[PDB]
Amino acid sequence: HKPDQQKLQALKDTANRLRISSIQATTAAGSGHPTSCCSAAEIMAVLFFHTMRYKSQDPRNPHNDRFVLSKGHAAPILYAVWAEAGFLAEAELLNLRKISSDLDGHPVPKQAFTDVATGSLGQGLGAACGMAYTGKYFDKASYRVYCLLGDGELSQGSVWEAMAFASIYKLDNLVAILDINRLGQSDPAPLQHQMDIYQKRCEAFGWHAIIVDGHSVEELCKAFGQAKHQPTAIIAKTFKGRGITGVEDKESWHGKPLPKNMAEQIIQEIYSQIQSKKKILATPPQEDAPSVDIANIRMPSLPSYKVGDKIATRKAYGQALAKLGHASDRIIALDGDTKNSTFSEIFKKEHPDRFIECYIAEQNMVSIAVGCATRNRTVPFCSTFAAFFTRAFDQIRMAAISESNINLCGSHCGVSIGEDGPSQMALEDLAMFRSVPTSTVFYPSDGVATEKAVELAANTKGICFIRTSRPENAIIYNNNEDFQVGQAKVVLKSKDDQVTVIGAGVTLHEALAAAELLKKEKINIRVLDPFTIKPLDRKLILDSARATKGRILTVEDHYYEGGIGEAVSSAVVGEPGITVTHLAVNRVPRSGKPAELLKMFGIDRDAIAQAVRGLIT
Amino acid sequence: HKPDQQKLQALKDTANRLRISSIQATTAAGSGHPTSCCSAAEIMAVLFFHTMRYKSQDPRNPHNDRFVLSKGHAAPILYAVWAEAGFLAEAELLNLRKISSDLDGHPVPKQAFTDVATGSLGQGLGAACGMAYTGKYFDKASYRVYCLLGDGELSQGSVWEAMAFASIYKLDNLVAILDINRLGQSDPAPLQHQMDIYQKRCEAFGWHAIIVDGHSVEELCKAFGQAKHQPTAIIAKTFKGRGITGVEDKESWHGKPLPKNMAEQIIQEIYSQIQSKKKILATPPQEDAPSVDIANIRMPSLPSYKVGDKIATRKAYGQALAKLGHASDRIIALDGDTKNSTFSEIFKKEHPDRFIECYIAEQNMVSIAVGCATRNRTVPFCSTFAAFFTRAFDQIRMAAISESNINLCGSHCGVSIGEDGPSQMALEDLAMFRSVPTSTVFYPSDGVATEKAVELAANTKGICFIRTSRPENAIIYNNNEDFQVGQAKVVLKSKDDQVTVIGAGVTLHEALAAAELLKKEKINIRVLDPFTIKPLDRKLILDSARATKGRILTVEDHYYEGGIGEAVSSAVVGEPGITVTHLAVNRVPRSGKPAELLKMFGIDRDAIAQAVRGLIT
Ligand SMILES: Cc1ncc(C[n+]2csc(CCOP(=O)(O)OP(=O)(O)O)c2C)c(N)n1
Ligand SMILES: Cc1ncc(C[n+]2csc(CCOP(=O)(O)OP(=O)(O)O)c2C)c(N)n1
Ligand SMILES: [Ca+2]
Ligand SMILES: [Ca+2]
Ligand code: NA
Ligand code: NA
């Protein structure tokens, strides 16, 4: 698939038009990364005007090839290709980085041509893997996926997780293009132009690796055209600032715009090398992506638990997820070699074609989910121990910037796991997920609440987190109980309540046990289950407090900062007559039995009862 | 260095004693991972009783070889070697996982023989790299560093970052042993027993890679004895549950103890294979680690700023760090290809031998710092953009479980960076660091406070975080101002103050500007700079509020959850007459000029003034 002579020259001309646009935009803004754009200009021309198939007036079309700009600071050249393709007006490029424009400093999905935000390096290939996995195994469509990475970027371990994933899953519809321009931000990239080492690394991770001159349209086209039996890495030897005389291949230019006078001079030089004005039209795709049903997802039946039966919420999650897979053909499940502990294995057993084993690689797992959710093709649920979602916080952070709809279930929360000790204990997961701006944080306290959290999460936009627990605890809700995001439940009350005790998961059950102890001493307490920690039901909390002498006690299997107690305090601070006492975990824990650790860390029934007795007196 | 016939058999006997101890301990506990111990028994015997050099009665001795158990769930066999070596009493092994014991489910540094906690897979090799870098380049000592990893564990990208680091820095004093036992937790590891692929991956990342039969003491000893010119990977083909008949090489046994009856039978079988009772003594090390000065670290002079001069706190950090490097020969600086933006380049210029370029690999950077701080050999300061510390949250979490003394400086906080947009904006870093139990969170508002934060951090135990900013802001403190952890500063006050406004960094300066605006309308406000967000100066905040009609307004360049406003609210909730109003960033931002974004997100001078006017009225 070698371009003919006219097309070849038109591709070279296109590359130079892209350089000019990148320089013009960044000089107009007074910030940005023209030298990072210029190393990629021939790559971008060949991708957008020779290799890819897409609808230039409908960038989000489900039939289109996908492009992911992993080196997101080259955003101006992404904008430039979409102007060249006729989607964006050329004049709009000059509004790069303005508060009045959507051509922001790094790509974001408010742009029709951007599926995932990038800017935190090393994440784009994982998203691309999810898109390619979806294309091959779910859509079974003809679209291909292309991802452009920098060489400095290849220092990120997340890249190598994605490399390994793509070869395990035989993603022969995925191409990674590595812009080996020798330089990072503040020094040369470690391997510089040792092209052979990059080739060996890619081959060792199972990819077909082709070294090219990244400024040769000819060599680029030959590499893209080769038969593809594996994921393919095009390892492109380039120069940073290519085409900018005196800047090409030099340090001290990363993220530095050309000054006005210099841009004018350089642009005239580049423009003089352009042989024809006639632009290339993109070739349209084969329209073989299937229709996908986006109707509200409804469980096929009510929960079928029995009040008083004991089940851990981790197990209820797996049961509910498997049931959800009968509610929608769009549900997919991902897990990081923990399916026997999170109980996502139950979904795998019933719907194996929609389970993705991600292995021990949580960063990549989140990125796969993000990629699978793009263009609304699937509804992903990822699971591992909640503690290990800390390993993926930047991916989760970027998922919110990507306006992604993913669902994450983290098990084994808190000290109540017992003997494994703190390395496995999630004690900061509420803090982390609450800080994610698009998040909904579910903390189901029994199996019924867990099933309803799964159903609600499936239908809720944004980053949904479900915190599950290891201990078996009693079912306390009837199967017809109606749950909503942002609505708490009062699970014990009387006209004589002296404190409102807010607990969740294991501490809700400890609070109910404390209530039984206290009733023997003629002390009644109101017990409230938040259901969602974010958004928090401020109204029910305050109404409860006002019925209980203004007194609130929050008790949580989590550290003090960023959790339930701080959420509650922040919601009610300043309200007349309201007081809040907080019980949480004050330091790194240790191994012991679950009940022993709840006692040691001051969040068990006897600690709750003592706090209540002290409040009354 | 092949063991003679008696020693060879003694090593085999030792391996079998280690198997027995691992089974006994986990059966006694009723939990743990004997099959993960048993694959490693010959490796552990050869390391501890042939290859390593260490003082068996002084595991923390600075002259000793280091061992890192990256696959930390094999803790029972680590405990077993230290019993075999005579440091632990054999009987204590039976108290594994008890709340009354320190032999916890995964290793932790309350154990003399543990430097870094493990249990979150994929982190140990990075810590080992820091130990080896320290041994070679700082201590210039003869000790070597050994790290045992699982094969499932090799799916983590952090491992490959460490691999790449070790070859860049020529860590020929580092050995990684890969326990290729075919199986993970819930399925086979992806590559199973494809030993050649592991070899190719390690070689491609610059290591000398040797495939061995991991149950052959002979082959293990030959591999350890080979000349070392590069970091060395011993790629050991093993079987999970080796030596446990009917369990060896089987699925469904990860993290499952043998029941009592079965343990008795298996242990008798293993014991029958032991030919001699005579234990091997460990060989002691060459005592060539240098003395290190642990005196309090004092800057050689007061800060030398001038009130009213403009400097960004990011630049003040670099200046202060370089000065700190003249205060102590122990200070080291690490940075992830951002030294020209964080200004750690200033330290590199003055103290290049103590600067470690970590490249674009934040997870590994944190682990390197943790390893360098072990045994108090250095005082590390790591820097990058604060947003990118989210990429290393699990490493930071584990650092606190490791009781590590590291210092982290994250620049470019908040929307005030302007045009790069949200991918680069730290808006959740206060939430994240506040949740880390051993943390001190410094948020210096000018260059003087920044210099004093650096000095204090150097002398403070735990995870110290310093949040720096991009905008140039005025110096407001005199050079002799005395700063302490947990002590705030009132930077503007009058007898007629009507609100206490708490700001930090850019929002402190916006609050001072608001005060100047408001004074024109005869409205005075008290302005308070927290200095440390954790611990928070509750007393000064409350005393200030009580002088200002009980009214507090907090304003921060951070999301609402987990930041300054929630810290303050949580501290003062329920105090009679106190009210708290909060201004923060309510959603994912976008590109624009710094001042435009502060306005858009409601945290600039005019937003503060409007909030104040509303509180009074
Ligand atoms: C996770 C992360 N860490 C650090 C940065 C800061 N950063 C932005 S661009 C860059 C250099 C990128 O170099 P490379 O990948 O070689 O791309 P090039 O611009 O040379 O094409 C750095 C370190 C980032 N954006 N993301
Ligand atoms: C970051 C992280 N993710 C997931 C886990 C859960 N986990 C504990 S052990 C294990 C399997 C480890 O297998 P491998 O590395 O092959 O070690 P082996 O026990 O086979 O020697 C898993 C997935 C963990 N501890 N850490
Ligand atoms: Ca580069
Ligand atoms: Ca294994
Ligand atoms: Na959802
Ligand atoms: Na410190």
Side-chain angles (χ1 to χ4, degrees):
Chain A
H1 303 294
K2 177 172 74 75
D4 56 77
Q5 163 260 90
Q6 185 263 30
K7 181 79 179 285
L8 176 59
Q9 188 59 49
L11 286 163
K12 295 177 187 176
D13 291 344
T14 300
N16 282 322
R17 285 190 280 273
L18 298 177
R19 289 186 167 86
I20 289 169
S21 290
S22 299
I23 292 165
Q24 286 176 325
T26 57
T27 291
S31 65
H33 300 73
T35 60
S36 301
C37 295
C38 285
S39 54
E42 285 77 20
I43 290 159
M44 294 290 287
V46 170
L47 282 168
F48 282 80
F49 301 97
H50 189 74
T51 296
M52 292 170 62
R53 299 288 178 268
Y54 62 96
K55 295 170 181 280
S56 63
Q57 289 305 308
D58 189 4
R60 284 261 165 64
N61 191 279
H63 306 296
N64 287 348
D65 290 348
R66 275 64 158 166
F67 174 72
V68 179
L69 184 62
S70 197
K71 43 170 273 171
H73 53 289
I77 201 166
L78 173 65
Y79 309 156
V81 294
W82 283 102
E84 185 77 352
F87 182 75
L88 291 181
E90 282 186 38
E92 182 56 17
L93 300 175
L94 304 180
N95 294 327
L96 177 70
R97 285 159 173 260
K98 292 187 183 183
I99 198 160
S100 50
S101 179
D102 276 0
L103 297 188
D104 289 29
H106 297 78
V108 275
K110 60 180 181 168
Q111 299 153 0
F113 50 78
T114 297
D115 295 306
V116 297
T118 57
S120 170
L121 289 166
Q123 299 195 28
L125 189 58
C129 284
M131 297 170 192
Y133 191 103
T134 294
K136 178 169 290 298
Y137 298 116
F138 302 146
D139 286 342
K140 303 184 174 188
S142 66
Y143 63 84
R144 291 169 61 76
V145 183
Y146 299 90
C147 180
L148 177 62
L149 295 103
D151 57 355
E153 180 167 27
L154 305 173
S155 292
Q156 288 284 12
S158 54
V159 169
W160 297 95
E161 296 178 6
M163 297 290 287
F165 178 98
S167 59
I168 290 164
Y169 292 114
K170 303 184 188 176
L171 302 182
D172 63 356
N173 59 341
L174 178 63
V175 176
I177 308 88
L178 315 184
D179 184 354
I180 314 299
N181 68 15
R182 201 180 62 83
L183 298 178
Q185 167 166 327
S186 71
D187 262 323
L191 295 178
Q192 297 204 45
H193 273 158
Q194 296 183 260
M195 306 307 295
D196 58 320
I197 300 183
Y198 288 110
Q199 182 179 17
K200 288 287 189 301
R201 289 182 182 191
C202 293
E203 287 176 344
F205 276 73
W207 289 53
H208 182 58
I210 307 166
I211 294 166
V212 301
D213 173 354
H215 301 309
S216 168
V217 165
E218 297 91 331
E219 289 191 27
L220 282 164
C221 289
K222 176 173 177 184
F224 284 117
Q226 284 186 34
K228 306 308 201 279
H229 309 269
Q230 291 159 84
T232 301
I234 298 180
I235 309 178
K237 181 175 179 179
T238 54
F239 296 95
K240 201 162 180 163
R242 178 67 168 188
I244 307 176
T245 311
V247 173
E248 177 168 339
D249 202 31
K250 306 298 170 67
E251 292 195 66
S252 302
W253 277 98
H254 180 86
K256 302 296 175 182
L258 298 193
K260 173 177 183 296
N261 73 290
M262 183 172 183
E264 287 170 2
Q265 192 284 317
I266 291 297
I267 287 166
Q268 179 177 347
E269 284 198 2
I270 297 167
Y271 189 74
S272 78
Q273 298 169 44
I274 293 172
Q275 300 188 11
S276 180
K277 297 189 187 303
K278 298 173 182 291
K279 304 187 182 302
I280 302 163
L281 296 191
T283 305
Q286 182 178 350
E287 300 198 16
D288 63 7
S291 61
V292 173
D293 189 342
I294 47 71
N296 190 255
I297 300 168
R298 281 266 321 284
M299 286 300 196
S301 61
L302 279 179
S304 58
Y305 292 101
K306 180 158 180 283
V307 166
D309 282 8
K310 306 298 180 72
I311 192 174
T313 61
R314 62 175 177 142
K315 188 180 286 183
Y317 168 74
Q319 295 178 352
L321 186 65
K323 188 173 177 172
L324 193 78
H326 289 292
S328 170
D329 296 327
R330 285 208 289 160
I331 307 309
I332 67 170
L334 305 85
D335 195 300
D337 195 30
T338 54
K339 59 183 164 287
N340 66 297
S341 291
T342 64
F343 290 101
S344 68
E345 68 182 5
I346 300 174
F347 182 101
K348 184 181 197 270
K349 179 164 193 296
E350 300 186 12
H351 314 287
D353 48 303
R354 289 186 284 148
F355 183 87
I356 310 179
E357 178 56 56
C358 292
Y359 298 101
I360 307 174
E362 298 82 12
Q363 293 192 356
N364 187 246
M365 176 174 64
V366 173
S367 297
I368 298 302
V370 170
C372 289
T374 63
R375 308 189 196 205
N376 307 319
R377 302 310 293 182
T378 69
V379 175
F381 279 76
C382 299
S383 50
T384 179
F385 288 29
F388 308 133
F389 279 125
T390 68
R391 191 59 155 277
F393 188 23
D394 193 20
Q395 284 78 12
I396 296 164
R397 182 186 74 90
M398 288 301 306
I401 299 172
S402 297
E403 302 175 0
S404 185
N405 304 310
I406 56 169
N407 308 284
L408 303 188
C409 178
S411 67
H412 289 64
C413 71
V415 308
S416 76
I417 74 174
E419 286 87 351
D420 272 353
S423 59
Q424 317 299 115
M425 294 171 178
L427 292 159
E428 57 289 290
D429 51 318
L430 298 176
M432 176 179 69
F433 282 105
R434 287 179 65 244
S435 78
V436 175
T438 59
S439 73
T440 304
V441 175
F442 298 89
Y443 194 169
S445 294
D446 82 355
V448 172
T450 302
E451 178 167 329
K452 304 320 281 186
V454 168
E455 186 180 42
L456 285 164
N459 293 298
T460 300
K461 292 186 290 295
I463 307 304
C464 292
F465 175 57
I466 305 174
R467 195 192 210 221
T468 65
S469 306
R470 188 176 186 259
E472 300 192 354
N473 290 335
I475 301 289
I476 61 171
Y477 292 111
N478 308 136
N479 292 317
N480 67 358
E481 187 67 28
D482 191 86
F483 284 90
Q484 308 296 338
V485 172
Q487 176 188 81
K489 299 288 183 174
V490 171
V491 297
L492 190 70
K493 59 181 184 304
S494 88
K495 66 184 181 71
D496 297 313
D497 292 340
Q498 302 194 46
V499 182
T500 291
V501 179
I502 302 178
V506 70
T507 65
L508 188 77
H509 297 279
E510 293 299 306
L512 290 168
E516 274 281 277
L517 292 168
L518 286 163
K519 206 178 300 301
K520 299 194 195 134
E521 308 172 359
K522 301 306 197 182
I523 297 170
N524 287 357
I525 59 167
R526 192 157 297 196
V527 179
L528 183 152
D529 189 25
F531 183 61
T532 54
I533 313 308
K534 179 178 174 182
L536 192 70
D537 192 346
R538 182 182 191 270
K539 179 179 170 52
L540 186 55
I541 290 165
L542 282 172
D543 289 347
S544 298
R546 290 188 197 114
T548 66
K549 311 220 181 310
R551 304 170 185 140
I552 300 168
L553 171 67
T554 306
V555 52
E556 63 185 310
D557 198 357
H558 187 275
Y559 290 143
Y560 279 83
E561 302 89 348
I564 307 180
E566 289 203 339
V568 169
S569 295
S570 296
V572 307
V573 62
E575 285 285 347
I578 304 304
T579 55
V580 183
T581 296
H582 188 187
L583 296 178
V585 178
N586 70 354
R587 65 204 189 266
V588 170
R590 49 143 318 124
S591 289
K593 296 175 194 181
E596 293 170 336
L597 297 182
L598 293 171
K599 182 174 301 304
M600 173 171 282
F601 297 98
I603 57 169
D604 75 347
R605 59 197 69 184
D606 307 297
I608 295 167
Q610 277 290 102
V612 170
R613 290 185 195 102
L615 287 170
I616 299 170
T617 74
Chain B
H1 303 294
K2 177 172 74 75
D4 56 77
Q5 163 260 90
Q6 185 263 30
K7 181 79 179 285
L8 176 59
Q9 188 59 49
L11 286 163
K12 295 177 187 176
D13 291 344
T14 300
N16 282 322
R17 285 190 280 273
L18 298 177
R19 289 186 167 86
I20 289 169
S21 290
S22 299
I23 292 165
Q24 286 176 325
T26 57
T27 291
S31 65
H33 300 73
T35 60
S36 301
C37 295
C38 285
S39 54
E42 285 77 20
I43 290 159
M44 294 290 287
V46 170
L47 282 168
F48 282 80
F49 301 97
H50 189 74
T51 296
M52 292 170 62
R53 299 288 178 268
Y54 62 96
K55 295 170 181 280
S56 63
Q57 289 305 308
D58 189 4
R60 284 261 165 64
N61 191 279
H63 306 296
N64 287 348
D65 290 348
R66 275 64 158 166
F67 174 72
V68 179
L69 184 62
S70 197
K71 43 170 273 171
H73 53 289
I77 201 166
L78 173 65
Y79 309 156
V81 294
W82 283 102
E84 185 77 352
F87 182 75
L88 291 181
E90 282 186 38
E92 182 56 17
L93 300 175
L94 304 180
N95 294 327
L96 177 70
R97 285 159 173 260
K98 292 187 183 183
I99 198 160
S100 50
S101 179
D102 276 0
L103 297 188
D104 289 29
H106 297 78
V108 275
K110 60 180 181 168
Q111 299 153 0
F113 50 78
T114 297
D115 295 306
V116 297
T118 57
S120 170
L121 289 166
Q123 299 195 28
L125 189 58
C129 284
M131 297 170 192
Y133 191 103
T134 294
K136 178 169 290 298
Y137 298 116
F138 302 146
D139 286 342
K140 303 184 174 188
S142 66
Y143 63 84
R144 291 169 61 76
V145 183
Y146 299 90
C147 180
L148 177 62
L149 295 103
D151 57 355
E153 180 167 27
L154 305 173
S155 292
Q156 288 284 12
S158 54
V159 169
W160 297 95
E161 296 178 6
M163 297 290 287
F165 178 98
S167 59
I168 290 164
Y169 292 114
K170 303 184 188 176
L171 302 182
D172 63 356
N173 59 341
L174 178 63
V175 176
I177 308 88
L178 315 184
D179 184 354
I180 314 299
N181 68 15
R182 201 180 62 83
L183 298 178
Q185 167 166 327
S186 71
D187 262 323
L191 295 178
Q192 297 204 45
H193 273 158
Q194 296 183 260
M195 306 307 295
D196 58 320
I197 300 183
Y198 288 110
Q199 182 179 17
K200 288 287 189 301
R201 289 182 182 191
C202 293
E203 287 176 344
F205 276 73
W207 289 53
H208 182 58
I210 307 166
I211 294 166
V212 301
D213 173 354
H215 301 309
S216 168
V217 165
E218 297 91 331
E219 289 191 27
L220 282 164
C221 289
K222 176 173 177 184
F224 284 117
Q226 284 186 34
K228 306 308 201 279
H229 309 269
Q230 291 159 84
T232 301
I234 298 180
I235 309 178
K237 181 175 179 179
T238 54
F239 296 95
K240 201 162 180 163
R242 178 67 168 188
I244 307 176
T245 311
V247 173
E248 177 168 339
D249 202 31
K250 306 298 170 67
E251 292 195 66
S252 302
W253 277 98
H254 180 86
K256 302 296 175 182
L258 298 193
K260 173 177 183 296
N261 73 290
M262 183 172 183
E264 287 170 2
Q265 192 284 317
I266 291 297
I267 287 166
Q268 179 177 347
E269 284 198 2
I270 297 167
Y271 189 74
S272 78
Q273 298 169 44
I274 293 172
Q275 300 188 11
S276 180
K277 297 189 187 303
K278 298 173 182 291
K279 304 187 182 302
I280 302 163
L281 296 191
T283 305
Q286 182 178 350
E287 300 198 16
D288 63 7
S291 61
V292 173
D293 189 342
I294 47 71
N296 190 255
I297 300 168
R298 281 266 321 284
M299 286 300 196
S301 61
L302 279 179
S304 58
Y305 292 101
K306 180 158 180 283
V307 166
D309 282 8
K310 306 298 180 72
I311 192 174
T313 61
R314 62 175 177 142
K315 188 180 286 183
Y317 168 74
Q319 295 178 352
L321 186 65
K323 188 173 177 172
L324 193 78
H326 289 292
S328 170
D329 296 327
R330 285 208 289 160
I331 307 309
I332 67 170
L334 305 85
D335 195 300
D337 195 30
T338 54
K339 59 183 164 287
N340 66 297
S341 291
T342 64
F343 290 101
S344 68
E345 68 182 5
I346 300 174
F347 182 101
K348 184 181 197 270
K349 179 164 193 296
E350 300 186 12
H351 314 287
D353 48 303
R354 289 186 284 148
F355 183 87
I356 310 179
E357 178 56 56
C358 292
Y359 298 101
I360 307 174
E362 298 82 12
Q363 293 192 356
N364 187 246
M365 176 174 64
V366 173
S367 297
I368 298 302
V370 170
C372 289
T374 63
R375 308 189 196 205
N376 307 319
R377 302 310 293 182
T378 69
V379 175
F381 279 76
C382 299
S383 50
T384 179
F385 288 29
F388 308 133
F389 279 125
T390 68
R391 191 59 155 277
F393 188 23
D394 193 20
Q395 284 78 12
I396 296 164
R397 182 186 74 90
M398 288 301 306
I401 299 172
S402 297
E403 302 175 0
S404 185
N405 304 310
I406 56 169
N407 308 284
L408 303 188
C409 178
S411 67
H412 289 64
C413 71
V415 308
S416 76
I417 74 174
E419 286 87 351
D420 272 353
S423 59
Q424 317 299 115
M425 294 171 178
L427 292 159
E428 57 289 290
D429 51 318
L430 298 176
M432 176 179 69
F433 282 105
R434 287 179 65 244
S435 78
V436 175
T438 59
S439 73
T440 304
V441 175
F442 298 89
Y443 194 169
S445 294
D446 82 355
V448 172
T450 302
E451 178 167 329
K452 304 320 281 186
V454 168
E455 186 180 42
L456 285 164
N459 293 298
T460 300
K461 292 186 290 295
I463 307 304
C464 292
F465 175 57
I466 305 174
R467 195 192 210 221
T468 65
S469 306
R470 188 176 186 259
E472 300 192 354
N473 290 335
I475 301 289
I476 61 171
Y477 292 111
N478 308 136
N479 292 317
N480 67 358
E481 187 67 28
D482 191 86
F483 284 90
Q484 308 296 338
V485 172
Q487 176 188 81
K489 299 288 183 174
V490 171
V491 297
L492 190 70
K493 59 181 184 304
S494 88
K495 66 184 181 71
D496 297 313
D497 292 340
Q498 302 194 46
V499 182
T500 291
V501 179
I502 302 178
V506 70
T507 65
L508 188 77
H509 297 279
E510 293 299 306
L512 290 168
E516 274 281 277
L517 292 168
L518 286 163
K519 206 178 300 301
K520 299 194 195 134
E521 308 172 359
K522 301 306 197 182
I523 297 170
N524 287 357
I525 59 167
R526 192 157 297 196
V527 179
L528 183 152
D529 189 25
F531 183 61
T532 54
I533 313 308
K534 179 178 174 182
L536 192 70
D537 192 346
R538 182 182 191 270
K539 179 179 170 52
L540 186 55
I541 290 165
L542 282 172
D543 289 347
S544 298
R546 290 188 197 114
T548 66
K549 311 220 181 310
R551 304 170 185 140
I552 300 168
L553 171 67
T554 306
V555 52
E556 63 185 310
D557 198 357
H558 187 275
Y559 290 143
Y560 279 83
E561 302 89 348
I564 307 180
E566 289 203 339
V568 169
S569 295
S570 296
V572 307
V573 62
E575 285 285 347
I578 304 304
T579 55
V580 183
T581 296
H582 188 187
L583 296 178
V585 178
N586 70 354
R587 65 204 189 266
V588 170
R590 49 143 318 124
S591 289
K593 296 175 194 181
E596 293 170 336
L597 297 182
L598 293 171
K599 182 174 301 304
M600 173 171 282
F601 297 98
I603 57 169
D604 75 347
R605 59 197 69 184
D606 307 297
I608 295 167
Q610 277 290 102
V612 170
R613 290 185 195 102
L615 287 170
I616 299 170
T617 74

